[PDB]
Design an enzyme around this catalytic site. Sequence first.
Site, PDB file in Angstrom:
ATOM      1  N   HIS A 148      54.811  68.306  65.431  1.00 20.44           N
ATOM      2  CA  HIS A 148      54.911  69.586  64.747  1.00 20.44           C
ATOM      3  C   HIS A 148      53.826  70.532  65.234  1.00 20.44           C
ATOM      4  CE1 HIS A 148      56.890  66.614  62.177  1.00 20.44           C
ATOM      5  NE2 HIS A 148      57.563  67.617  61.652  1.00 20.44           N
ATOM      6  N   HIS A 153      58.622  74.801  64.130  1.00 20.69           N
ATOM      7  CA  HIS A 153      58.085  73.985  63.039  1.00 20.69           C
ATOM      8  C   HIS A 153      57.885  72.536  63.468  1.00 20.69           C
ATOM      9  CE1 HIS A 153      57.892  71.733  59.260  1.00 20.69           C
ATOM     10  NE2 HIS A 153      58.839  70.986  59.793  1.00 20.69           N
ATOM     11  N   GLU A 197      54.575  62.322  35.046  1.00 18.92           N
ATOM     12  CA  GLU A 197      54.346  61.004  35.633  1.00 18.92           C
ATOM     13  C   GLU A 197      54.032  61.063  37.128  1.00 18.92           C
ATOM     14  OE1 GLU A 197      57.169  61.748  33.979  1.00 18.92           O
ATOM     15  OE2 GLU A 197      57.025  60.603  32.111  1.00 18.92           O
ATOM     16  N   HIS A 224      66.136  54.250  28.802  1.00 18.71           N
ATOM     17  CA  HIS A 224      64.733  53.902  28.726  1.00 18.71           C
ATOM     18  C   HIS A 224      64.450  52.475  29.166  1.00 18.71           C
ATOM     19  CE1 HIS A 224      64.485  57.702  26.711  1.00 18.71           C
ATOM     20  NE2 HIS A 224      63.237  57.532  26.339  1.00 18.71           N
TER      21      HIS A 224
HETATM   22  C1  LIG Z   1      60.491  61.386  31.981  1.00 17.89           C
HETATM   23  C2  LIG Z   1      60.095  60.972  30.601  1.00 17.89           C
HETATM   24  N1  LIG Z   1      58.743  60.787  30.302  1.00 17.89           N
HETATM   25  C3  LIG Z   1      58.332  60.394  29.034  1.00 17.89           C
HETATM   26  C4  LIG Z   1      59.316  60.196  28.072  1.00 17.89           C
HETATM   27  C5  LIG Z   1      58.821  59.754  26.714  1.00 17.89           C
HETATM   28  N2  LIG Z   1      58.890  60.825  25.760  1.00 17.89           N
HETATM   29  C6  LIG Z   1      59.946  61.019  24.896  1.00 17.89           C
HETATM   30  S1  LIG Z   1      59.802  62.289  23.937  1.00 17.89           S
HETATM   31  C7  LIG Z   1      58.375  62.629  24.599  1.00 17.89           C
HETATM   32  C8  LIG Z   1      57.707  63.843  24.063  1.00 17.89           C
HETATM   33  C9  LIG Z   1      58.662  64.986  24.256  1.00 17.89           C
HETATM   34  O1  LIG Z   1      57.978  66.120  23.838  1.00 17.89           O
HETATM   35  P1  LIG Z   1      58.919  67.370  23.540  1.00 17.89           P
HETATM   36  O2  LIG Z   1      59.898  67.383  24.689  1.00 17.89           O
HETATM   37  O3  LIG Z   1      57.993  68.553  23.354  1.00 17.89           O
HETATM   38  O4  LIG Z   1      59.737  66.946  22.214  1.00 17.89           O
HETATM   39  P2  LIG Z   1      59.299  67.310  20.703  1.00 17.89           P
HETATM   40  O5  LIG Z   1      58.015  66.567  20.360  1.00 17.89           O
HETATM   41  O6  LIG Z   1      59.053  68.772  20.498  1.00 17.89           O
HETATM   42  O7  LIG Z   1      60.415  66.887  19.798  1.00 17.89           O
HETATM   43  C10 LIG Z   1      57.948  61.787  25.608  1.00 17.89           C
HETATM   44  C11 LIG Z   1      56.639  61.939  26.350  1.00 17.89           C
HETATM   45  C12 LIG Z   1      60.686  60.391  28.376  1.00 17.89           C
HETATM   46  N3  LIG Z   1      61.611  60.200  27.430  1.00 17.89           N
HETATM   47  N4  LIG Z   1      61.098  60.799  29.653  1.00 17.89           N
HETATM   48  C1  LIG Z   2      59.049  64.914  49.992  1.00 17.70           C
HETATM   49  C2  LIG Z   2      59.446  65.326  51.372  1.00 17.70           C
HETATM   50  N1  LIG Z   2      60.666  65.976  51.570  1.00 17.70           N
HETATM   51  C3  LIG Z   2      61.077  66.368  52.838  1.00 17.70           C
HETATM   52  C4  LIG Z   2      60.226  66.096  53.902  1.00 17.70           C
HETATM   53  C5  LIG Z   2      60.724  66.527  55.262  1.00 17.70           C
HETATM   54  N2  LIG Z   2      60.025  67.692  55.729  1.00 17.70           N
HETATM   55  C6  LIG Z   2      58.927  67.649  56.559  1.00 17.70           C
HETATM   56  S1  LIG Z   2      58.309  69.076  56.929  1.00 17.70           S
HETATM   57  C7  LIG Z   2      59.438  69.797  56.035  1.00 17.70           C
HETATM   58  C8  LIG Z   2      59.345  71.278  55.982  1.00 17.70           C
HETATM   59  C9  LIG Z   2      57.975  71.611  55.467  1.00 17.70           C
HETATM   60  O1  LIG Z   2      57.949  72.993  55.335  1.00 17.70           O
HETATM   61  P1  LIG Z   2      56.483  73.606  55.227  1.00 17.70           P
HETATM   62  O2  LIG Z   2      55.761  72.681  54.277  1.00 17.70           O
HETATM   63  O3  LIG Z   2      56.666  75.057  54.837  1.00 17.70           O
HETATM   64  O4  LIG Z   2      55.848  73.382  56.694  1.00 17.70           O
HETATM   65  P2  LIG Z   2      55.877  74.469  57.888  1.00 17.70           P
HETATM   66  O5  LIG Z   2      57.314  74.669  58.349  1.00 17.70           O
HETATM   67  O6  LIG Z   2      55.334  75.804  57.482  1.00 17.70           O
HETATM   68  O7  LIG Z   2      55.031  73.933  59.002  1.00 17.70           O
HETATM   69  C10 LIG Z   2      60.336  68.967  55.392  1.00 17.70           C
HETATM   70  C11 LIG Z   2      61.466  69.452  54.510  1.00 17.70           C
HETATM   71  C12 LIG Z   2      58.985  65.444  53.699  1.00 17.70           C
HETATM   72  N3  LIG Z   2      58.182  65.199  54.740  1.00 17.70           N
HETATM   73  N4  LIG Z   2      58.567  65.058  52.416  1.00 17.70           N
HETATM   74  O1  LIG Z   3      60.771  58.290  24.727  1.00 15.61           O
HETATM   75  C1  LIG Z   3      61.161  58.434  23.606  1.00 15.61           C
HETATM   76  C2  LIG Z   3      62.126  59.575  23.301  1.00 15.61           C
HETATM   77  O2  LIG Z   3      62.737  59.960  24.502  1.00 15.61           O
HETATM   78  C3  LIG Z   3      60.744  57.485  22.475  1.00 15.61           C
HETATM   79  O3  LIG Z   3      60.218  56.340  23.072  1.00 15.61           O
HETATM   80  C4  LIG Z   3      59.725  58.131  21.511  1.00 15.61           C
HETATM   81  O4  LIG Z   3      59.380  59.430  21.961  1.00 15.61           O
HETATM   82  C5  LIG Z   3      58.510  57.226  21.241  1.00 15.61           C
HETATM   83  O5  LIG Z   3      57.801  56.901  22.403  1.00 15.61           O
HETATM   84  C6  LIG Z   3      59.046  55.961  20.545  1.00 15.61           C
HETATM   85  O6  LIG Z   3      58.605  54.777  21.126  1.00 15.61           O
HETATM   86  P1  LIG Z   3      57.853  53.615  20.213  1.00 15.61           P
HETATM   87  O7  LIG Z   3      56.351  53.771  20.349  1.00 15.61           O
HETATM   88  O8  LIG Z   3      58.234  53.676  18.745  1.00 15.61           O
HETATM   89  O9  LIG Z   3      58.273  52.273  20.750  1.00 15.61           O
HETATM   90  O1  LIG Z   4      59.565  65.188  57.862  1.00 13.67           O
HETATM   91  C1  LIG Z   4      59.035  65.539  58.875  1.00 13.67           C
HETATM   92  C2  LIG Z   4      57.602  66.058  58.817  1.00 13.67           C
HETATM   93  O2  LIG Z   4      57.016  65.585  57.635  1.00 13.67           O
HETATM   94  C3  LIG Z   4      59.744  65.452  60.232  1.00 13.67           C
HETATM   95  O3  LIG Z   4      60.834  64.597  60.073  1.00 13.67           O
HETATM   96  C4  LIG Z   4      60.191  66.835  60.753  1.00 13.67           C
HETATM   97  O4  LIG Z   4      59.887  67.840  59.800  1.00 13.67           O
HETATM   98  C5  LIG Z   4      61.658  66.847  61.218  1.00 13.67           C
HETATM   99  O5  LIG Z   4      62.556  66.500  60.203  1.00 13.67           O
HETATM  100  C6  LIG Z   4      61.754  65.869  62.405  1.00 13.67           C
HETATM  101  O6  LIG Z   4      62.789  64.948  62.283  1.00 13.67           O
HETATM  102  P1  LIG Z   4      63.916  64.779  63.487  1.00 13.67           P
HETATM  103  O7  LIG Z   4      65.143  65.597  63.138  1.00 13.67           O
HETATM  104  O8  LIG Z   4      63.398  65.204  64.849  1.00 13.67           O
HETATM  105  O9  LIG Z   4      64.285  63.321  63.562  1.00 13.67           O
END
Ligand SMILES: Cc1ncc(C[n+]2csc(CCOP(=O)(O)OP(=O)(O)O)c2C)c(N)n1
Ligand SMILES: Cc1ncc(C[n+]2csc(CCOP(=O)(O)OP(=O)(O)O)c2C)c(N)n1
Ligand SMILES: O=C(CO)[C@@H](O)[C@H](O)[C@H](O)COP(=O)(O)O
Ligand SMILES: O=C(CO)[C@@H](O)[C@H](O)[C@H](O)COP(=O)(O)O
Lengths: 676, 676
Positions: free
Chosen positions: B26, B260, B414, B477
């Site tokens: 690149h 690129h 996460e 979950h």
């Molecule tokens: C990707 C993901 N991460 C964590 C959880 C666990 N989880 C369930 S509800 C919750 C809190 C959600 O907060 P919000 O969306 O603001 O709901 P509210 O408390 O207002 O009802 C979490 C962290 C999940 N369900 N999915």
């Molecule tokens: C998570 C992830 N998705 C896709 C790629 C493939 N990929 C490598 S470079 C690239 C483009 C990156 O664009 P940019 O970050 O703007 O780099 P630039 O073209 O300016 O050099 C992609 C899609 C990757 N390396 N990682």
């Molecule tokens: O993720 C979720 C909702 O999407 C649930 O797990 C609750 O938000 C809480 O975490 C209950 O889990 P317990 O602690 O009662 O097992």
């Molecule tokens: O992801 C990346 C960089 O992080 C590379 O793969 C290039 O950005 C391009 O995709 C090259 O791949 P080729 O198409 O030459 O195999």
Amino acid sequence: SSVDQKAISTIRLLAVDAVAAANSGHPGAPLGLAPAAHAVFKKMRFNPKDTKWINRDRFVLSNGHACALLYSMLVLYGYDLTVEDLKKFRQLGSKTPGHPENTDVPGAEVTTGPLGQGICNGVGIALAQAQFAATYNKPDFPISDSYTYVFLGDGCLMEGVSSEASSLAGHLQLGNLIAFWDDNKISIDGSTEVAFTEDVIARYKSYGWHIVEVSDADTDITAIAAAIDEAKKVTNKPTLVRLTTTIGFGSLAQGTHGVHGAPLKADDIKQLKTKWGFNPEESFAVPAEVTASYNEHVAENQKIQQQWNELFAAYKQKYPELGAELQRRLDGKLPENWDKALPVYTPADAAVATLKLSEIVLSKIIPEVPEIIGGSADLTPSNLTKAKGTVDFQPAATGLGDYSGRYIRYGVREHAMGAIMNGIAAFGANYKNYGGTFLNFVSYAAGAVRLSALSEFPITWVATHDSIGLGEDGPTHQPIETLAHFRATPNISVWRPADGNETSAAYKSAIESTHTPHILALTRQNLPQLEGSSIEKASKGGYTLVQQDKADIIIVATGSEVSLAVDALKVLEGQGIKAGVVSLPDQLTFDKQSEEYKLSVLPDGVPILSVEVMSTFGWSKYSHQQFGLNRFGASGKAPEIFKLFEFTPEGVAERAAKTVAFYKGKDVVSPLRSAF
Amino acid sequence: SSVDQKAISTIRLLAVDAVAAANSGHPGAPLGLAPAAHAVFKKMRFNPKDTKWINRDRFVLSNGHACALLYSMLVLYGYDLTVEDLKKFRQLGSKTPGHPENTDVPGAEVTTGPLGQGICNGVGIALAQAQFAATYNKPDFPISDSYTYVFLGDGCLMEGVSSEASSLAGHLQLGNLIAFWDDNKISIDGSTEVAFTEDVIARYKSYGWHIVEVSDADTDITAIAAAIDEAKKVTNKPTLVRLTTTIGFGSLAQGTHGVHGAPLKADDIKQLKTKWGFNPEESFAVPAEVTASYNEHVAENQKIQQQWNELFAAYKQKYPELGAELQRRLDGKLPENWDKALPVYTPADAAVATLKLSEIVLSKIIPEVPEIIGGSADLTPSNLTKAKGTVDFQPAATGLGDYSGRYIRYGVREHAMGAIMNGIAAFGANYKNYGGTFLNFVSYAAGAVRLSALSEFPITWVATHDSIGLGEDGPTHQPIETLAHFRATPNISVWRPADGNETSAAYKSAIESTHTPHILALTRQNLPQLEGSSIEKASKGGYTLVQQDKADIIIVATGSEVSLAVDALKVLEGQGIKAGVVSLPDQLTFDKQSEEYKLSVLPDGVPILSVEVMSTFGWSKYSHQQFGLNRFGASGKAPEIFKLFEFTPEGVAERAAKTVAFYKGKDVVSPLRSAF
Ligand SMILES: Cc1ncc(C[n+]2csc(CCOP(=O)(O)OP(=O)(O)O)c2C)c(N)n1
Ligand SMILES: Cc1ncc(C[n+]2csc(CCOP(=O)(O)OP(=O)(O)O)c2C)c(N)n1
Ligand SMILES: O=C(CO)[C@@H](O)[C@H](O)[C@H](O)COP(=O)(O)O
Ligand SMILES: O=C(CO)[C@@H](O)[C@H](O)[C@H](O)COP(=O)(O)O
Ligand SMILES: [Ca+2]
Ligand SMILES: [Ca+2]
């Protein structure tokens, strides 16, 4: 005193009672969002007796833990979900699981709960609606004019996948999308002040969304309805409606994190009921004035669908071709003999990378199957996922495409692409949609991929650069664990085609799929056309490529390693060892074949060696010994990497010879056999 | 005519020549970012002869495909990387892989390339620096006062993980972090106009970042240096420096997507060299005036480190306790006998969920081991990841914590938590840092988790709610594929402890780790203390829990299924079948034991049945037959789910009896045996 107030109370108390019956679940957000749910469903067009009506408005609960709210709405509107089902909330085998499942819950468009997913699914439903409308609408024929309504919370706004999808939705000017943020300042850990202090509204404006703020969403349903009306006037921006609510509204513990995810105390439920005019001794109360009011809205909606059916009948008269296409799609059927468009190869054809073969397939089938749309996550020149002569899906206002376009520029947004693909599938109308990236970065989208499987959605990942075969980009780009991960996930078809004919079989499976997501693992490097391959044979998932009636060993391989296995067979011949070769382009498709078919491919009485240049996990289902790669890769020219790891004809032949020696003088039964 | 101009040209041409030698890689972003790289490294404090100096400024190339730029800087500054290494760019076994690897490249702080990761790693390095400085700095003793400099591109800004980390970094007021956006309007697919039209600057302001814009970053290195100075004045906000650049600056194809990711044409390289005063017939040119200028900056930096070493010596005199702690940490050593703090249980103790046992361990070891910090992704009351008596990591200005705090509120993020954990580990000073979420949502962070493994970072996931044992939240979950995915990834220790003693062993491994990330799979449901468990035995990864010299079968299990296996042993006894039980809390740790140890646990001559309530993938390494769960879960009370799927003492005993019957009259060898 209004029936609207009574409906909101009914919804709130159904949700609380459901959680109470289960002694499990989330009462807080249902209590806070019942006013908004009532207002939104009153503006929505839907038929509880026809959940597939293609011009329905769609609702998505992205904060899926709040599903007692959704279930209460579906019950009150007379979907195929009853008060008895609510009483079985969170119980084994019920239609009211603890997070909503599109496979189990009538009126659940998608499976949500994992945070961030639903809003991205809504972006996909809205994308599909825009494409569908642009394809079929004609003057005086608004075949498709529906909206996508999404509820989401703080959690969804923190998950990066929603940022990806919101950036893209703003770029795509998706004015059919109306999302509602439950701005209640509470997450699981406590106040949002401890981890989430960004200016959400300013961020959404930076994406190009329209904003409406409802400062009292606990009571001001007039303002919520007006916010929907305002959103509909803004046809070139998705809208975020900020609902300022009290989590757990009405509970003694309202406005605290304790009401988020635990059942309310008995005395709390009693005072909720008494202050809203309900009987504290009664559970699952449904005032008839509420279901009558709701039944009226259903009746109006059913009249709208009846008229839509007449509109569609008149459309088919005026536009017989388009109308027949639309009818076919709504019936769930692909074009007759569409698969005649699939390319077929012979061993006289040149070697071709399977990512290039994939490009060729798409170039042939996209013109034949209008319900195919798809895109790439900024890897279009590398995945080769666009068919020449198609236009990109873009708002016409940009000059860069049109909503009738068929190729989506997802940008560098794998996870949102996966969840948007789920939304496009969820829209219906037989959409068979795909998304391209490097196989190793499908893993960025694992949260959405597993929901494709759980939701039974026929989405397709065009997953190129599948192994150390990609060479110089090195171990940050080279899959090792990836196929094992997705093969271990229930209901994912993981195709790794070896040549032209197998690549056509993989697409035949992916496009015909109705209930199973596909991942197509494709090579950067050129592979020979195999003697013995065909679409028909590869359609069985696993097949005998080289049949050897007197085999000392069978080598089972996939993808780029099938040609390697055939070359190893030639080496073995010179060592006095007879080998057969099995090609296993999809393990799931193979697994679903009859036991007799599977045993004809992997019979008793012969040692079986698997060869695939990535994890050996899973391979003991099909082989006695496994030759794979269980360490990370390396940056170098691909042939040198293969030589280093002894994925050569001689290295495979050595391990085959050792396998034959290992079992010398022992009976061997098929790996398909099991004790239970 | 200036040496600065000559250095920038040298960097540009080294990068181009490296790509040319490989005929892979690149050149575009290296050409566009050489001015900024030159300016940034001139402001940075570092010692090429001591890459571990704890008060160095850190540099992270998040747009890792641009690594020919990084390697050129490291060569020019006299790191342990030479021009000969540059000539081997992207070649098998070289120190210049196609994306930078911290394990292989001197001066590479982290492994980048997968987009979005590096900027999140930089957030983690900055978080660690803030915590470290708050812990050790005293009046007149600025032990830690370093900055974190990150380059990133459009791709990184599109990946949701960077949104997560940027929201959090703004919230955390991380004024030590200075990021540089390569605003060159080009991604792989072409112009950013096709998919990335958001107002990036407004978004970053919405997170609370400071902004400096450099309108001509192709030439205005004075403005880039001034932007760094301005960023340093803003001590309570991370800063984003917008570098408006021409991708491929100088190439005939500058400002296009073709530059690129492909090598430049030969004539293009010739005209680049000639117009910048270099010899078009020469490759890998290094003007001595450039390395002399750079050597001066190195000398100044080495004087700064020499003074820092004297500052540290004086600190140890004034603060002997803190100074000895710091020295120990910089030597890579845990406190003497720290493991005496680990809780130990007996079978007379009550049943406890392993997530609760984890809470107890953390409450005992966090006071004893100051280099432990960690947090949760908004699941603190469910993961139980905070030790009572600790303070949250927050800016003091918020009133919610302090930078000396030890508990991080990651929010619902996460993936960024995983990549931030990698940055905290990368900081050094023996940080042993952890992050809590539900096991099923570790998958949201797969992109970062695999880099923990590839980078050899001793991070720890506290991954609770590990199975259908969680019950009512249901199949959205409940992990099925998750352990298989991460066990199939090289270099991940996946602990699934069965009881109190095993949970202490898992933490002993995770905290002692120097090169291997850990995932601790922990239960919601209560498990009994096992007869036969101990920290010592579980530290071997797999051990004989119930030894049966005359075994008809050995049941090997993990986690919650070990107690089930023991109950199945009792059922089998009544059927005349003698069983042994093996507990396998970590497959990787077990695998690393001697062959003789492993065969003592899984001997020849006895059928072995595995039991674990999720995917059977991987289990044929250890068993002849596998009882697992290869479908999605269900929403219901956990005991009812286990009964439905026959994970009961009777159901396990039935499959054990069938396994014994299956092998009746046949010799059986250990699953550990292989042909090669
Ligand atoms: C990707 C993901 N991460 C964590 C959880 C666990 N989880 C369930 S509800 C919750 C809190 C959600 O907060 P919000 O969306 O603001 O709901 P509210 O408390 O207002 O009802 C979490 C962290 C999940 N369900 N999915
Ligand atoms: C998570 C992830 N998705 C896709 C790629 C493939 N990929 C490598 S470079 C690239 C483009 C990156 O664009 P940019 O970050 O703007 O780099 P630039 O073209 O300016 O050099 C992609 C899609 C990757 N390396 N990682
Ligand atoms: O993720 C979720 C909702 O999407 C649930 O797990 C609750 O938000 C809480 O975490 C209950 O889990 P317990 O602690 O009662 O097992
Ligand atoms: O992801 C990346 C960089 O992080 C590379 O793969 C290039 O950005 C391009 O995709 C090259 O791949 P080729 O198409 O030459 O195999
Ligand atoms: Ca909230
Ligand atoms: Ca760019």
